[PDB]
C-alpha cells in the first residue's frame with residue numbers, strides 16, 4: 001500500500017475548471033455521466049492523465065467527444081483510470097465519461113449509497129472517486145453543474161449543492177432537477193440527496209448584509225416531528241458565528257438532512273449538510289437528554305465549517321486539524337455559550353484525558369499534523385480533532401478574546417476561498433501576538449511544535465513560600481516522553497492559567513495570570529503574597545498536558561471547596577481519587593500476587609468524603625458539577641497511570657472506593673435523589689419542542705448518577721424508587737431505570753417494558769440497545785446473544801452494530817473476562833463488519849487501543865485476536881493497516 005508523505009506535496013499537472021454531472025438513478029443501477037472541462041497546469045510535464053475512480057463500471061470515456069478505446073488509449077484497474085499522455089490534449093479540453101454504480105448495494109456508506117429509502121452521498125475524504133472519475137484531492141477546485149433524475153414517486157425531493165435552476169418532468173414517471181454551484185469547491189464537498197423527504201423550514205436574516213437565508217431541515221416522513229431542535233440549533237449557530245466572529249452565511253439556502261445509515265456523526269457538504277439521524281433528530285418523548293447537546297454540537301460544528309473548511313479550504317489532507325481541530329474549538333466556544341453550564345468544558349476535558357491521552361501513549365500516537373499516512377484513519381482521530389481543538393484553544397488563552405478575534409479575522413480575510421495550511425493559521429495568530437505584546441520581534445515559531453510533536457507533555461510543579469519576604473515561587477518543569485515520532489522532544493509553548501487562593505478565606509490573591517512556559521523549566525516568582533497560597537493551576541484546563549500539581553490532599557480539598565475555576569476543582573477531585581485508586585490498586589494487586597489470606601486497605605480520606613458531602617448539600621452548587629464529583633475517573637483515564645493494568649484488580653479497587661464513600665454518603669444521596677425530583681423531572685415544557693434547559697438535564701444526570709450509586713449499594717427499598725423511575729416520561733429516566741435494575745430481580749421485567757417503549761422509534765431503539773449493552777449483568781454475554789438473535793440480526797446499520805457492542809466493551813469486569821471471550825466476541829463482530837463496511841469495522845477496534853497497557857495475560861489474549869483478524873484473507877486495506885500499526889508489526 002502507498003505511503004504518502006507530507007513533504008511530498010506537489011500541485012497536479014492538470015486543472016479541472018468545471019464539472020457537469022448527470023446522475024440518473026434507476027432501480028438496479030445509477031448512471032453517472034460526467035464532463036470535465038480541464039486544462040494543463042504550469043506544473044505539467046506531459047505526464048499520463050490519471051483519474052481516481054473506485055469500483056466504477058465504464059460505459060464510455062471520451063476526450064473532446066472522441067470516444068477512447070480501452071487498452072489502446074486508456075487502462076482502468078478499478079482504482080485508477082490512466083489516459084496515456086499521447087492522447088491527452090495540450091490545451092483546454094473536455095474529458096467525459098459514463099459509468100454505472102450501484103448505491104443499493106453500497107453498504108460501506110461511502111460514495112453514493114442507499115440509506116433505507118434515501119439515496120445519499122458521502123464524499124469526504126476520498127468518496128467522490130466512487131461516484132465518477134476525478135483527480136480526487138482537496139486542492140482540485142472546480143465549478144459544479146449537477147443534474148439528478150429519478151423516479152418521482154420514490155424520490156420527489158432532489159438535492160445537490162448550489163441553486164436549483166431547473167426542475168423538469170421525464171417520460172416514464174421520472175423527474176429531474178439541475179443545480180448550479182458556480183463558486184469553486186473541492187470535490188469532497190459535493191453532495192446529492194434524493195428521497196421522499198419531509199421538512200421544517202425557517203428564514204434567517206443575517207446580521208449585517210440583512211440577506212435572507214432559507215433554512216430547511218429534512219428527514220423521512222416518520223420522524224419529521226423530531227426536526228425542530230435541529231432547526232433551533234442551526235439558528236443559534238448562525239447567530240454565534242455572527243456575534244463572536246462577525247461572520248455571516250454567504251448562500252441563499254442551507255439544507256440539513258438526516259439519514260439512518262451513516263459512518264460518522266455528520267458532514268459539512270456546502271449548503272447541504274448530511275447527518276446521522278442520531279445527531280439531528282430528537283424529541284422529548286423519544287430521545288434521551290444527551291441527544292439535545294449532541295445535536296447542538298453537531299449542527300453547530302458542521303455550520304462552523306462553512307468558514308473553517310468550506311471557504312478557507314485545505315490544500316491536502318495533512319492539514320485536516322486546521323479544519324477539524326479549529327472547527328471543534330469553534331463549536332466548543334458556541335456550546336459553552338449556549339449551555340451556560342460548566343459541564344460542557346468539563347465533558348470535553350474528560351474525553352481528551354481519557355480517550356485522546358490513551359491514543360497519544362498508544363502505538364497509534366501521532367501529532368495533530370502527521371508526516372505520513374497510508375490510510376485516512378491516520379487523520380480522522382481524537383488526536384487530530386480533540387487535541388487539535390485544544391491547540392486551537394491555546395491561541396485564545398495566550399491572546400485573550402480581543403486579540404484572538406483579531407487574529408482569527410486576519411486568517412479568514414487573508415485566506416477566504418483559498419487553501420491554507422497550519423502555518424497560515426499560526427502566522428495570523430502571530431500577527432495578533434505581535435500586536436498584543438507590542439513588538440514585531442515576538443513570534444510564535446515555538447508554537448508550531450504543537451503541530452509536529454506527538455505525545456502528551458507532563459507538567460510538574462514545586463513551590464516555595466518565604467513568609468518574611470511575602471514572596472511565592474512556582475517552579476515548573478515540562479517533559480514529553482520520547483516515542484516513535486521524536487527521539488528527542490523539544491519544550492513546547494505551554495500557557496498555564498493560574499490563580500493563587502488564600503487558604504484562610506478562599507479569596508483570589510492575584511489577577512488573571514497566564515504563565516508562559518517556553519523552556520524545559522522556569523521559576524515564576526510573585527511578590528507581595530501575604531500568606532502562603534494554594535495554587536490553582538491550569539484553570540479551564542489551559543494546555544493539553546498531564547498535570548502533576550504535587551499538592552497534598554488537604555490542599556486539593558480546599559481547592560475543591562473554595563476555588564473559582566471549575567476545571568481546577570474537578571481536577572483536584574480527580575487527583576484525590578487517583579491517589580486513592582493507585583494506592584488501593586497496589587494493595588489489591590499485592591494481595592492477589594502474594595495470595596494473602598488477609599491484608600489491609602487504605603480507607604478513603606474522611607475529609608475528602610466530608611467535602612463531597614459539603615458540596616452535594618450546597619443548594620447553590622451546580623448539579624452537573626456534583627455528578628462529576630461522585631463519579632470516579634474514567635477507566636481509560638486511570639489506565640494512563642498504571643503499567644500492566646489488571647482490569648479485575650482495577651474493578652475491585654473501584655468497588656471498594658465506591659462502597660467506602662457510599663457507606664458514608666448513601667443517606668445524603670437518597671435525600672438528594674428525592675429532593676431533586678420536582679425540578680429535574682418538571683413536565684411544564686415537555687410539549688414545548690424548542691424549550692431546552694441544560695441545567696434541568698444536568699439535574700436529571702445527577703439523579704440518575706445517584707440512583708445508580710444507590711442501586712449498586714442495594715440501598716434499602718431502592719427498588720421502589722427504581723420502579724417509579726421506570727414510569728417517568730423522560731427516556732433518560734426510564735432507560736436509567738433499566739440499567740440500575742440490573743442489580744435486582746426486576747431487570748427482565750424492565751427490559752421488556754422499556755423495549756416496548758423503544759421499539760417503534762429507530763433511534764430510541766438504538767438507545768435501548770446501548771442501555772442493555774452497558775447493563776451491569778452477570779449474564780451479559782447471554783443478553784448480547786439475545787440482542788443478536790431478536791433485535792440486531794444481520795442489520796448493516798452502523799448505529800445498530802455500534803449500539804449493541806461498544807457500550808459492552810466498557811464493561812471492565814466482563815469485557816475483559818480473563819478467558820478472552822469478550823475480545824473474541826468483538827473480533828468476530830469486526831471481522832463480520834469488515835466484509836461490508838471497513839470504516840465501521842475499524843471504529844469497532846476501539847477497545848483494542850489499550851491492549852499493550854494491560855496485564856500480560858490480557859495483552860496476549862488481545863494480541864491473539866488482533867493477529868487472528870490480521871490473518872483474515874478477505875481483510876480490508878483499512879482494517880489491515882490499522883491493526884498492523886496498532887500491533888506494532
Ligand SMILES: CC(C)C[C@H](NC(=O)[C@@H](O)[C@H](N)Cc1ccc(OCc2ccccc2)cc1)C(=O)O
Nearest residue numbers: 124125264265266267268297298301302376377380
Ligand atoms: C461535532 C463533530 C466533531 C462531529 C463529527 N463531524 C465531523 O467529523 C465532520 O465535520 C467531518 N468533516 C466528517 C467526516 C468524518 C470522518 C470521515 O472519515 C474519513 C475516513 C476514511 C477512512 C478511514 C477513516 C476516516 C469523513 C468525514 C462526526 O461526524 O462525528
Ligand SMILES: [Mg+2]
Nearest residue numbers: 260762795797
Ligand atoms: Mg433500521
Ligand SMILES: [Zn+2]
Nearest residue numbers: 301305324327
Ligand atoms: Zn468537522
